[PDB]
Scaffold this active site. Structure first.
Site, PDB file in Angstrom:
ATOM      1  N   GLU A   1      -2.504 -10.148   9.197  1.00 44.54           N
ATOM      2  CA  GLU A   1      -1.287 -10.821   8.231  1.00 44.54           C
ATOM      3  C   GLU A   1      -0.164 -10.948   8.777  1.00 44.54           C
ATOM      4  O   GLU A   1       0.420 -11.925   8.866  1.00 44.54           O
ATOM      5  CB  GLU A   1      -1.419 -10.173   6.824  1.00 44.54           C
ATOM      6  CG  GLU A   1      -2.454 -10.532   5.980  1.00 44.54           C
ATOM      7  CD  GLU A   1      -3.264  -9.108   6.061  1.00 44.54           C
ATOM      8  OE1 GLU A   1      -3.973  -8.561   6.942  1.00 44.54           O
ATOM      9  OE2 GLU A   1      -3.534  -8.562   4.673  1.00 44.54           O
TER      10      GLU A   1
ATOM     11  N   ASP B   1      -0.855  -5.022   5.687  1.00 47.64           N
ATOM     12  CA  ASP B   1      -1.864  -6.029   5.084  1.00 47.64           C
ATOM     13  C   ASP B   1      -1.556  -6.194   3.572  1.00 47.64           C
ATOM     14  O   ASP B   1      -0.910  -5.095   3.122  1.00 47.64           O
ATOM     15  CB  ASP B   1      -3.202  -5.323   5.232  1.00 47.64           C
ATOM     16  CG  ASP B   1      -3.371  -4.154   4.645  1.00 47.64           C
ATOM     17  OD1 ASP B   1      -2.437  -3.088   4.917  1.00 47.64           O
ATOM     18  OD2 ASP B   1      -4.231  -3.644   3.849  1.00 47.64           O
ATOM     19  N   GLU B   2      -2.142  -7.108   3.000  1.00 51.33           N
ATOM     20  CA  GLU B   2      -2.106  -7.568   1.332  1.00 51.33           C
ATOM     21  C   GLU B   2      -0.894  -7.140   0.774  1.00 51.33           C
ATOM     22  O   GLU B   2      -0.752  -6.603  -0.261  1.00 51.33           O
ATOM     23  CB  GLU B   2      -3.423  -6.850   0.836  1.00 51.33           C
ATOM     24  CG  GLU B   2      -4.583  -7.190   1.492  1.00 51.33           C
ATOM     25  CD  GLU B   2      -5.754  -5.936   0.619  1.00 51.33           C
ATOM     26  OE1 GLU B   2      -5.484  -4.779   0.591  1.00 51.33           O
ATOM     27  OE2 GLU B   2      -6.605  -6.779   0.489  1.00 51.33           O
ATOM     28  N   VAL B   3       0.292  -7.456   1.445  1.00 52.60           N
ATOM     29  CA  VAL B   3       1.606  -7.456   0.731  1.00 52.60           C
ATOM     30  C   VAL B   3       1.506  -8.452  -0.441  1.00 52.60           C
ATOM     31  O   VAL B   3       1.570  -9.822  -0.095  1.00 52.60           O
ATOM     32  CB  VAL B   3       2.749  -7.627   1.760  1.00 52.60           C
ATOM     33  CG1 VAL B   3       4.107  -7.770   0.955  1.00 52.60           C
ATOM     34  CG2 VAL B   3       2.856  -6.534   2.831  1.00 52.60           C
TER      35      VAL B   3
ATOM     36  N   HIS C   1       0.638  -1.206   0.134  1.00 52.77           N
ATOM     37  CA  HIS C   1      -0.069  -0.144  -0.046  1.00 52.77           C
ATOM     38  C   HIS C   1       0.778   1.133   0.109  1.00 52.77           C
ATOM     39  O   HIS C   1       0.352   2.272   0.527  1.00 52.77           O
ATOM     40  CB  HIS C   1      -1.128  -0.010   1.068  1.00 52.77           C
ATOM     41  CG  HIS C   1      -2.133  -0.930   1.005  1.00 52.77           C
ATOM     42  ND1 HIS C   1      -2.981  -0.934   0.000  1.00 52.77           N
ATOM     43  CD2 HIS C   1      -2.251  -2.272   1.494  1.00 52.77           C
ATOM     44  CE1 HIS C   1      -3.802  -1.805   0.061  1.00 52.77           C
ATOM     45  NE2 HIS C   1      -3.511  -2.847   0.991  1.00 52.77           N
TER      46      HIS C   1
END
Ligand SMILES: *[C@@H]1O[C@H](CO)[C@@H](O[C@@H]2O[C@H](CO)[C@@H](O)[C@H](O)[C@H]2NC(C)=O)[C@H](O)[C@H]1NC(C)=O
Ligand SMILES: *[C@@H]1O[C@H](CO)[C@@H](O[C@@H]2O[C@H](CO)[C@@H](O)[C@H](O)[C@H]2NC(C)=O)[C@H](O)[C@H]1NC(C)=O
Lengths: 480, 480
Positions: free
Chosen positions: A335, A282-284, A226
């Site tokens: 995560e 988050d969401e790497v 992000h």
């Protein structure tokens, strides 16, 4: 028409009347606070306007312990209070300023106008304190810039709902509106334009405005994913992709990364007074790291194999260490915990994934970490109908665990991600849907009568509208 | 950045500039319209403001046939036009006023400011006319009262999107805001309160404001169902329920019903100048009629058995006859057609049920009736994400039928039912989601490139915001 419903409410049929130009809110002579307390003085004046906008002549406000007038609220701030409504002088008593603010809101919800316009209130006693101490709203100012004014209005609405945390997701892939003093190029090159930036003074204003309402400002500077907007102004930070996008997550193998993050987070530790900084995590995406040759070299240099969770863990651990060294606490998306990073005791884990979230709460609490729930309260995920009900019906402690684990559940946040939200639609989308989450986090576990919730929330929503918050309707009807 | 995309657009790389205090919009000397034409004069002035808010000095507007300046628009109104942008005088040519209004909107979408603020337009030729002639927005002012101002703003937004019908669902179960002169008690007893009413003058204002933008006002006074508010003021109209609610649909067995509806619709025929009146006829519940003894008596009196569709048909046929006798056309929801009522030729059927709607379109058109589609365009049914795409991708003529049947498809409506909508949220929810429907109904069948649609619609949406319409975002981004 109380919202959230107080812990204990005992009323009499005895009505008392109030005279707007002969009704004062003042400091009880035994209080630890006085005229010097800006926070209480400003609250007295704004609640006078909200209330009015056999005779109770005065509401006396008594702070019992060191008031904490000039301090910033924190996770253990005492928000308890009692309210005694009687003639001629009502009394609001609280351990601290934080409880008095909550009690002023409740007092204003008790005053009403009868059919002939007469300001009226019932004789009553209220005892109240919150069920959870972390009660947050997440706003996203990267996907769309939100003008300072709409952040201030959201803070007003939060105060009316007894929310106490603004989780400010300030930057993301699309834009970097945070003006950094030590790194001016982050905003100069990363913002949508120069009028879509938050100056040091804009940030101070939001923090101060929040403090006056007993609201903590929790900054989130999400990494390593992000972060696309970060790369415009900080060269060599992001990993170049050998091919599906152009740039990927922050490059965790370079020493310039950690030197940059040290200097950057040190600035953040000074700008944001809250004890906690949300580091994200988050969401790497690993495809960029996987396709990069220098990263592949680094991976074998300390035996990470083909497991990129270990590289993510390595990065996150170094950032957690930087936060610890500047004497702040860290908050992290699940995560980071799920990918087996080593977290120091006290690190708060925010559970946001909607699949098997109760089991996530068990795992996090069983490992000893404090936990915050956001999973079922993603208010950006709109749907047809009375979705406020589903948010209300959530019972956060319905997960498997001992009492010790349940004591590690410190609260929750209602999240309004910004892909489809800006100033044109933020307020109607947020309120009163977040009010459902606010009651669930403030009130007792057993407060769940749906008919009663609907009765109080329509009226509360009309009250929000009367005070300038354009909260959307629950169902057909009208106000006034 | 044209929206809807015109039929034919041919541009040159030659740029021309405009000077705000030296640019006029005026009547070509050969036009049938002149200064007397209020409609064109007001449009000239408001578009001057929208445009500005090597030199093209003038936009000349030429009406070729009898202008229809003082008339109300109808289903066959000619909205075609051509636009020739050149120096020193551009020319807008149209058969009627209706086409000139459309062309003024397009002209304003062609003018833009370059990087230094210079008002600029490309030399170009545009030929345009709509694919369908019924292009509607349904608003619901019963579930929530909408102030006149937000109805006027919606009409402005409709003009920017080339919509030409306001389907005003004015009354329903929850409230009756329509003030009737011949029946004052309908609003006095049926409205939410006396400040939630539309006076004869409010109605005239909406009609006139609409006319000036080439927009037809189609009133809907839904019966026999959706009429609970009607019973407060008109005694003996509704069927009493022997038991699940208290009152059900309009009582179709009484002569006072039809005498009331005759007098009432006669008033409507005079108030609303449009050729059509929408009679509704959707979602009639039979349980009340079934449980009523006098209705049971009536059912056997002319052999309807236990088939309450025949009683509904009997009622609807009498109402259709009343409309015919006052020389107006009728529009009806599909149920009236599906329940085998005998409809006179010319009766428009509105297809709203989302299950097998293409097959519904076939059946209606095969039986000879003109048809309007609303089924896939229920904008009250919100969902997460870019739902504008699904509305855009609808190809309305993908149903089974001959060319003759396809010529009976006259258009569609985007519907915004009011259970969850009022002034706090109407505009962001409506726009730009309805813009997707507006292009699909205006532009060619083959205009469906999604990337291009997204490019033009974000810019169009920013234009709506610049003009005071708070249209919500499509995705992350910013304006200006
Ligand atoms: C606040 O006081 C009012 C006024 O006494 C209460 O209202 C009434 O309650 C009495 C006794 O229960 C009834 O006889 C009246 O019909 C009620 N309304 C009116 C118009 O007086 C009200 O209940 C009190 N609030 C609470 C929750 O105790
Ligand atoms: C409107 O005119 C402009 C200016 O000529 C057009 O823009 C340019 O097109 C030329 C030739 O195709 C290019 O060399 C330029 O790079 C373009 N931009 C600039 C800054 O001049 C534009 O294409 C025209 N619009 C259309 C659709 O014809």
């Amino acid at each position: 028409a109380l919202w959230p419903l107080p812990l204990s409410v005992k009323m009499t049929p005895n009505l008392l009347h109030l005279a707007p130009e002969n009704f004062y809110i003042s400091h009880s002579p035994n209080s630890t606070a006085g005229p010097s307390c800006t926070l209480l003085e400003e609250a007295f004046r704004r609640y006078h306007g909200y209330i009015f906008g056999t005779q109770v002549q005065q509401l006396l406000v008594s702070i019992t312990l060191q008031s904490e007038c000039d301090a910033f609220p924190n996770i253990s701030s005492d928000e308890s209070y009692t309210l005694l409504v009687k003639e001629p002088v009502a009394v609001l008593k609280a351990n601290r300023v934080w409880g008095a603010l909550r009690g002023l809101e409740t007092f204003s919800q008790l005053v009403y106008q009868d059919s002939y316009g007469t300001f009226t209130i019932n004789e009553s006693t209220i005892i109240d304190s919150p069920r959870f101490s972390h009660r947050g709203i997440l706003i996203d100012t990267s996907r769309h810039y939100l003008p300072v004014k709409i952040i201030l209005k959201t803070l007003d609405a939060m105060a009316f709902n007894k929310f106490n945390v603004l989780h400010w997701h300030i930057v993301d892939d699309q834009s970097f509106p945070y003006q950094s003093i030590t790194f001016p190029e982050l905003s100069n090159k990363g913002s949508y334009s120069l009028s879509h930036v938050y100056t040091p003074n804009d940030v101070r204003m939001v923090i101060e405005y929040a403090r006056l309402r007993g609201i903590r400002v929790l900054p989130e500077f999400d990494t390593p994913g992000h972060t696309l907007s970060w790369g415009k102004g900080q060269k060599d930070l992001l990993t170049p992709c050998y091919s599906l996008d152009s740039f990927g997550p922050i490059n965790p193998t370079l020493n310039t990364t950690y030197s940059f993050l040290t200097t950057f987070f040190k600035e953040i530790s000074e700008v944001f007074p809250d004890q906690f900084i949300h580091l994200g995590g988050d969401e790497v995406e690993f495809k960029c790291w996987e396709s990069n040759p220098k990263i592949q070299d680094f991976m074998r240099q300390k035996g990470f194999g083909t497991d990129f969770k270990k590289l993510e863990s390595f990065y996150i651990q170094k950032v957690l260490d930087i936060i610890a060294t500047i004497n702040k606490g860290s908050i992290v998306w699940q995560e980071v915990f799920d990918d087996k990073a080593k977290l120091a005791p006290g690190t708060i884990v925010e559970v946001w994934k909607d699949s098997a979230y109760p089991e996530e709460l068990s795992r996090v609490t069983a490992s000893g970490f404090p936990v915050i729930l956001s999973a079922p309260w993603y208010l950006d995920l709109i749907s047809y109908g009375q979705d406020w009900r589903k948010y209300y019906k959530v019972e956060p402690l319905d997960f498997g665990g001992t009492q010790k684990q349940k004591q590690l559940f410190i609260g929750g946040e209602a999240c309004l991600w910004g892909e489809y939200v800006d100033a044109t639609n933020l307020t109607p989308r947020l309120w009163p849907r977040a009010s459902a989450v606010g009651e669930r986090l403030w009130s007792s576990k057993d407060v769940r009568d749906m008919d009663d919730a609907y009765d109080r929330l329509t009226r509360h929503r009309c009250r929000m509208v009367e005070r300038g918050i354009a909260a959307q309707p629950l169902y057909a009807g009208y106000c006034n």
